[PDB]
C-alpha cells in the first residue's frame, strides 16, 4: 500500500523509542517562561526604540520608500535550502496532493501526517510515532555547510536562503527563545551559524527564511477553555496558518496529544510579542542577513502579527551598513472588516497585500508584472522538501531547468531554486546533477544573465532576450540550435558593432536585410557538435553603438 522494501524509503527503525525531551511543555512553563518573557520585553523595547528613532516606521507608506537593492536585481539565481525534520520521512504523493500553487509539499509532512498523509504515516512510521520523533533522526551527519555553499557558488547563484525556521518552529540557529533548535534537537550544531560563516568566506548574500506563525504554540492563559482541560493556565494558540479549519485562536491543551508535537517550545502569554518579535530580532542581530524571506504570514493579519515592526527594524539596522531586501510575505494589511468580507465572499485580498520589496510566485509563475521585481521558488520537481520517490521521470532535466531559468530572467524574475536534502543532510545525486548542469551552463553564459535587465521584447519564438544595464549589449538566448543561420525578426534600432556566441572567441558575420531582419551565418565548424560550445541554450551577444 505505502510500505515498500525499497531501501531508499525512510521508515520506522526496529529500535524506535519515543522521544521525550528532557523538559516537558509544563517543565518549560515552570522553569523558562518567566525568564523568556522578561528577556522578550527588554528586546521588544529596544526594537521599538530603534523604529521610533529610525528612518523606517512600521507602516505601509514608510516601508514602501525602501527600494529593491541593485544586488537583488542583478542576482537572478538563488539557492533555497529546504531542510528540516520533514526531510527525515521525505514524502508526498508524486501526484494528486498538489496545493493551489501546483507544488507538492513533503515539507508539510509534520502537519499533514495527522490528516492527508495519515495512511502513509500509519503504515510506514506508525500511529504511535509522533511529529517530534523525527527530530532525533535529523542527524545532519552528511550535512557540510561549506560544501553546500560551494555547490551554490559553483551553480552561479548569488544568494543562499536556508529554511531557518519553518512552520513547526524548529530553528536552524541556536536561539535563546526556544529549545526547539538545531543545537538541542537533531544535528547538535548551529547550522545557520555554519552557513552564515560559509557565506562570508565565499562572498555569498545570505537570506533569513522565517515563518511568522507556527502551526501550534503553547500559550499561557488566565481562563481554561473547557471542563476537560487537564492543565491549568496553558492552551494551544492556532491561527489560519494550517489552512484547514481549526479551533482558533485557542485549542484546549492536552499533554498526551500536544507535547510530542511542540517539544522545546517555551510557553508565553503573547506569541507575537514574547516570542516571534524577539526571535526575529535575535537572528537579525546575530547573523546580519542580507535578505528576509517571510513565510506563513497568512496566519494572522499584520495588525496582530506585528511584522511591520520586524520589517522596519530590519531596514533600520541595515542603514549605512548594507543594502537589504524583504520578500512580500509579511502578511495582510486588511482590517478585521475587510477580512470578514473576504471570508463571506481575491480582488479584496490582493488590495491588502502591500508589504515587501518583491513578489514571490510559488512553483507556477502565472501572470507576473514584469515591470516590478519578482522571484519564483521551486525545486527541480513539484516537491518542496525531499521526496524519496523523486527521480528522472518526476524531475526537470538540466535542459528544461536551464530553459526555464532563461525565461524567468528575460521576464525580470529571479529563480530561487529549492534544493531538498534527506534527513542525514545528503543531497540526492539527481539534484546535485541538475545544479552541476546549471553551473556548467553558467560558466559559459553567465554574462548574459547576471546584471542584466529585460529588453523591449522578452521572447521571439524560441529566443529569449536580456540586455546589459547600459543597453549597449543585447543577449539572444536560443533554446533551439539555430543551425546554419540565426535570424532575428524583432527590430533593432541602433547600429551593431559585432556579434559572438558565448563559449567561442570567434566573431560572427552579420547583415541587416532591407526589411530590418538580422541574419547571422553560423560557421560550419560549429554544426557538427554545437553542444561542445554550450549545452541546451546558445547565447549570442550583440554589441550596439
What residues line the site for Na ion (CB under 5 A)? 64
Please answer whether residues 26 and 231 qualify as being in contact, where contact means their C-beta atoms are separated by less than 8 angstroms. yes
Exactly one of 26, 68, 137, 225 binds a second copy (CB under 8 A); which one? 225
Under the binding rule (CB under 8 A), the answer on residue 124 touching a second copy is: no
Q: Which does residue 523 touch among Na ion, a second copy, none (CB within 5 to 8 A, set by kind)?
A: none
Q: What is the per-residue binding string for a second copy in 352-391, x denoting contact by CB under 8 A? A: ----------------------------------------
DSSP secondary structure code for residue 500 in this structure: E
252 binds a second copy (CB under 8 A): yes
Residue 126 interacts with a second copy (CB under 8 A): yes or no: yes
Cα 325 to chain centroid, rounded: 14
Least Å distance between CB 75 and a second copy?
Answer: 30
Applying CB under 8 A, does 257 fall inside the site for a second copy?
Answer: yes
- C-alpha–C-alpha distance, residues 353 and 536, integer Å: 38
Q: Is residue 245 classed as helix, strand or coil in its secondary structure?
A: coil
**If binding is defined by CB under 8 A, does position 50 make contact with a second copy?**
no
Position 119 contacts a second copy (CB under 8 A): yes
How far apart are CB 339 and a second copy at their closest, in Å?
A: 17
Query: Among residues 203 and 222, whose Cβ is nearest to a second copy?
Result: 222
Under DSSP, the state recorded for 369 is: -
Q: Which stretch binds a second copy (CB under 8 A): 20-28, 211-219, 249-257, 511-519?
A: 249-257
Pick between residue 165 and residue 373 the one whose CB is nearest to Na ion.
373
Radius of gyration (C-alpha) of the chain in whole angstroms: 25
List, as one string, the DSSP characters of 300-366. Answer: S-HHHH-HHHHHHHHHHHHTTT---EEBS-S-----HHHHHHHHH--HHHHHT----SBB--BS---
Exposed e or buried b per residue across 190-202, where buried means at least 16 C-beta atoms within 10 angstroms of its C-beta: bbbbbbbbbbeee
Give which of a second copy, Na ion, none residue 250 binds (C-beta under 5 to 8 Å, depending on kind).
a second copy
| Smallest separation (angstroms) from a second copy to the CB of 389 | 18
Question: Strands across the sheet with 325-326, in order?
Answer: 325-326, 291-295, 205-211, 159-162, 77-81, 413-419, 374-378
486 binds a second copy (CB under 8 A): no
Question: Is residue 256 close enough to count as binding a second copy by CB under 8 A?
Answer: yes
245 binding a second copy? (CB under 8 A): yes
Q: Does 99 bind a second copy (CB under 8 A)?
A: yes
Neighbours of 203 (CB within 10 A): 8
d(CA 154, CA 133): 35
* Min dist. Cβ of residue 237 to a second copy (A): 11
The verdict on whether omega for the bond into residue 135 sits within 30 degrees of 0, i.e. cis, is: no
Give me 341's grid cell.
468580507
Return residues touching a second copy (CB under 8 A).
Answer: 97, 99-100, 112, 114-116, 118-119, 122, 126-128, 225-230, 243-247, 250-252, 254-257
Amino acid at each position: 500500500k505505502h510500505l515498500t522494501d525499497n531501501i531508499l524509503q525512510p521508515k520506522r527503525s526496529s529500535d524506535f523509542m519515543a522521544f521525550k525531551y528532557e523538559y516537558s511543555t509544563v517543565d518549560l512553563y515552570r522553569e523558562f517562561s518567566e525568564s523568556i518573557m522578561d528577556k522578550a520585553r527588554s528586546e521588544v523595547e529596544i526594537l521599538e526604540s530603534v523604529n521610533r528613532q529610525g528612518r523606517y516606521k512600521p507602516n505601509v507608506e514608510s516601508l514602501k520608500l525602501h527600494e529593491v537593492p541593485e544586488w537583488f536585481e542583478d542576482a537572478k539565481l538563488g539557492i533555497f535550502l529546504d531542510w528540516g525534520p520533514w526531510s527525515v520521512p521525505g514524502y508526498a504523493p508524486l501526484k494528486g496532493a498538489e496545493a493551489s500553487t501546483g507544488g507538492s509539499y513533503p515539507d508539510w509532512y509534520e502537519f499533514l501526517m495527522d490528516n492527508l498523509y495519515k495512511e502513509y504515516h500509519d503504515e510506514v512510521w506508525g500511529a504511535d510515532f509522533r511529529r517530534d520523533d523525527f527530530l532525533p533522526l535529523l542527524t545532519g551527519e552528511n550535512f557540510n555547510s561549506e560544501e553546500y555553499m560551494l555547490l551554490a557558488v559553483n551553480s552561479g547563484a548569488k544568494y543562499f536562503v536556508p529554511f531557518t525556521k519553518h512552520h513547526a518552529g524548529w530553528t536552524m540557529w541556536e536561539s535563546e527563545f526556544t529549545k526547539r533548535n538545531a543545537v538541542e534537537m537533531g544535528p547538535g550544531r548551529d547550522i545557520y551559524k555554519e552557513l552564515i560563516e560559509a557565506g562570508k568566506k565565499y562572498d555569498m548574500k545570505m537570506g533569513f527564511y522565517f515563518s511568522v506563525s507556527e502551526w501550534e504554540y503553547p500559550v499561557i492563559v488566565d481562563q481554561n477553555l473547557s471542563q476537560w482541560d487537564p492543565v491549568k493556565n496553558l492552551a494551544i494558540f492556532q491561527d489560519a496558518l494550517g489552512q484547514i479549519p481549526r479551533a482558533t485562536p485557542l485549542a484546549s491543551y492536552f499533554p498526551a496529544l500536544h507535547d510530542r508535537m511542540i517539544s522545546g517550545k517555551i510557553p508565553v502569554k503573547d506569541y507575537f510579542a514574547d516570542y516571534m518579535i524577539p526571535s526575529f530580532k535575535e537572528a537579525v542581530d546575530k547573523y546580519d542577513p542580507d535578505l528576509v524571506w517571510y513565510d506563513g504570514g497568512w496566519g494572522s493579519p499584520v495588525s496582530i502579527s506585528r511584522t511591520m515592526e520586524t520589517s522596519a527594524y530590519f531596514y533600520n539596522q541595515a542603514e549605512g551598513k548594507k543594502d537589504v531586501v524583504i520578500n512580500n510575505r509579511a502578511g495582510s494589511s486588511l482590517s478585521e472588516d475587510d477580512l470578514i468580507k473576504v471570508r463571506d465572499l481575491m480582488k479584496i485580498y490582493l488590495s491588502g497585500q502591500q508589504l515587501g520589496d518583491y513578489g514571490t510566485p510559488e512553483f507556477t509563475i502565472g501572470d507576473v508584472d514584469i515591470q516590478s521585481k519578482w522571484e519564483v521558488c521551486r525545486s527541480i520537481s513539484p516537491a518542496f522538501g525531499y521526496n524519496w520517490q523523486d527521480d528522472e521521470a518526476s524531475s526537470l532535466s538540466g535542459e528544461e531547468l536551464i530553459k526555464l531559468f532563461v525565461d524567468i530572467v528575460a521576464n525580470n524574475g529571479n529563480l530561487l531554486l529549492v534544493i531538498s536534502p534527506d534527513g542525514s543532510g545528503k543531497l540526492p545525486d539527481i539534484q546535485k546533477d541538475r545544479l552541476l548542469e546549471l553551473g556548467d551552463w553558467m560558466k559559459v553564459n553567465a554574462e548574459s544573465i547576471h546584471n542584466t535587465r529585460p529588453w523591449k521584447v522578452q521572447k521571439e519564438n524560441d529566443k529569449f532576450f536580456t540586455k546589459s544595464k547600459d543597453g549597449k549589449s543585447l543577449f539572444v538566448h536560443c533554446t533551439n540550435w539555430p543551425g546554419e543561420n540565426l535570424i532575428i525578426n524583432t527590430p533593432i534600432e541602433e547600429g551593431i558593432k559585432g556579434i559572438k556566441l558565448l563559449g567561442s572567441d570567434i566573431n560572427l558575420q552579420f547583415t541587416k536585410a532591407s526589411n530590418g531582419n538580422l541574419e547571422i551565418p553560423i560557421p560550419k565548424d560549429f554544426q557538427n557538435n554545437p553542444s561542445l560550445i554550450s549545452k541546451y541554450v546558445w547565447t549570442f551577444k550583440i554589441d550596439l553603438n
